[PDB]
Assembly symmetry: C3
Homo-oligomer: 272 residues x 3
């Protein structure tokens, strides 16, 4: 399936099953395929599951412009409009946690039932004047330098810290191959611009505007997006939010802790 | 090229050359690209060759619903009508042998000139109460368990028994990379649903409805689709079918025995 | 993005940025992604960059017919008509240097401001009765034989001489993986047909019809398209052409000499006028 964004960008999405809708937002470098196990899980258990490829990623068009959170949220808004979804549970991984939040911030929660933030960059990732505990900006500057040199090798190297393979997590050669294959479909321009986006976007104002049930899951061994200054604070700022911390879990915990995540997601959807 | 199916599914295909049309139906985990050598071979010899990516595979859409042989057959039906084909030679590999057979069963043979079944699941793969010699269903349930955990590694591990690498067949790392690349395009849901499909679907009634010249080819070293209870039986059930057995050949003989298959396909067309 | 060619083939393209248009034509086995770095460099510096997947490659359709330089040229002409481009700088790598050259010969240079030939097959790759210095046709016959047995392995093996890895160039496994992944998207037919095309197509007539400022860049360690009988000769045959030779550079110098190429393209786009 696809739909056309306002600026003319074609976005690829999957729409599986029937019942209450659940809309997934993927992380940096990936596409909708990072959700396949979670989507299959819930759709054969009576839910409708929807995942899209962010502009510049996967099977979607690769525009030069609009590689910003504001546009990402608006893309999501249009997907929901195109499908006429109601009572939507928004699920965001990594940087994809930003755009599900930014959606609610910009469009309200009229159509939203709940929110799930998986190892998300909310509320801030990068360091600010009034947020020194964040990740220094020279880290992300070093990313862009290597991306603009050899992004193929960078993605390949990203696998080890991402999955926590350098810390005794066992991930198959297949998953490593699949991760790199998907990553290479993406736009070099979108890859680099996203760094800027997720590094410097402040979602603290968004945190105040979330007025739906919220589940925050984060690994305490996450080497990419540090729990202490992201997930932990997100659960504090969002009213009535629940937190679950997976012990020793890495960034890419949708792979390593797949069964745990599937059950937590289902439990959340069945609340009260 | 693509067409839009009844339910709205977009299906990618290739239409090469001109002449007598030959329509290819690919196996599990693969796509239209597995046919590339056969297609170039025949089309550069004055045939028209057509191959589609099955729903949920390759460059086609990935619908939740319709992952069954009845729908698979209707998809072929729609392709044929889209291209206004007549005197088609249906060629099917593995589970792809199912939907070509079901097509003939559902729509009749008016547009069909011939049928070729390559290491095909027909007439019946999995075990039934009235088919005890079939493959026990738990074998396929074990496939589902692994696929629902890590399909990426499953595909990767599948290369060895598929190609007969574990029996001293020679396949490059190139082919192995391409097989995994093509496989990873596929829908998880479609991959799983297909096991149910090829495991439990009965094509015995379909065998009676095949009224066209048929060539059955199967390798006797096949570690995936057992020759003894499929291909051997298919040739017996289809009226006037011809059987060729490739000695010690694996399931993926389209690769290992490519030249022989190319020659046998040409020979059939010139019957 | 895509457009529909005359025969109904759909061709994928990228159209990035604003400014004077730069139109990239990729080489054998590849697609528009080989240009990502050049495209990002130029588009962040005031230029509009456009790159298509040749028919039978990348994300484009894979037709049986029309895998020849005439159609290739017409495909470029239809893209230019579709976006209504003017003052285009045509940039072609390897076999893609042939299709930009043929475009100019067929359609003229009304909409063309300049031409850049990178490791191009121009003016002639394969041997001829009146061009014995070309690569003997037996070599290309051998290519097809192998491609028609196992193209997947051929591409994988091709990485070494393509990037000059066998001569101590440093190329990451990532790049090697990317090159093989992209190449596998392509049609078997297009792959083989292109060999016939680049082996036998004579662009010598075309050279005489190129009336625009031209930059020829080639590496003098090129193992695929030999400098001495291609780039070196193109620089003589096209009137007013500028030549730049990258020392010990391989065929795939857009990877190994990325930064050098980027600055060379920008310099060329920013050139001044001459008096004639
Ligand atoms: C399989 C098929 O019918 N293909 C043609 C087709 O689907 N369309 C409809 N289009 C789209 O769906 C565009 N994308 C979205 O709406 C997300 C528009 N079509 C084309 O773009 C045709 N031209 C090219 O593909 C270059 C036709
Ligand atoms: C630069 C280089 O040597 N590249 C080869 C390469 O990276 N691959 C990709 N593969 C893997 O990474 C294997 N998996 C793991 O290491 C977890 C697959 N490759 C091979 O296995 C090479 N040989 C064969 O496939 C026969 C190639």
């Amino acid at each position: 399936s696809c739909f056309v964004a306002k600026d003319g960008t074609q976005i690829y999405f999957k729409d599986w099953g029937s019942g209450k809708p659940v809309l997934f937002s993927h992380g940096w470098l990936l596409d909708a395929d990072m959700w396949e196990y979670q989507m299959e899980y819930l759709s054969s258990r009576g839910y409708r599951t929807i995942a899209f490829d962010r502009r510049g990623f996967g099977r979607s068009d690769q525009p030069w412009t609009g590689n910003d959170y504001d546009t990402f949220a608006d893309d999501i808004a249009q997907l929901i409009e195109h499908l006429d979804l109601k009572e939507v549970t928004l699920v965001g991984f990594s940087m994809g946690g930003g755009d599900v939040a930014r959606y609610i911030a910009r469009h309200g929660s009229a159509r939203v039932a709940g929110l799930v933030l998986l190892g998300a960059v909310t509320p801030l990732f990068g360091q600010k004047p009034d947020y020194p505990q964040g990740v220094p900006l020279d880290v992300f500057a070093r990313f862009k330098t290597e991306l603009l040199k050899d992004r193929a090798q960078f993605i390949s190297d990203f696998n080890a810290p991402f999955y926590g393979i350098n810390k005794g997590q066992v991930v198959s050669c297949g998953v490593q191959t699949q991760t790199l294959q998907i990553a290479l479909l993406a736009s070099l321009k979108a890859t680099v611009d996203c760094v800027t986006a997720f590094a410097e976007t402040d979602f603290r104002p968004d945190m105040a505007k979330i007025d739906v049930p919220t589940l925050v899951i984060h690994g305490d061994g996450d080497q990419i997006v540090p729990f202490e200054t992201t997930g932990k604070v997100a659960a504090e700022l969002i009213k009535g939010a629940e937190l679950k911390v997976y012990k020793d879990a890495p960034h890419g915990f949708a792979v390593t802790h797949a069964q745990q995540l599937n059950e937590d997601l289902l439990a959340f959807l069945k609340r009260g």
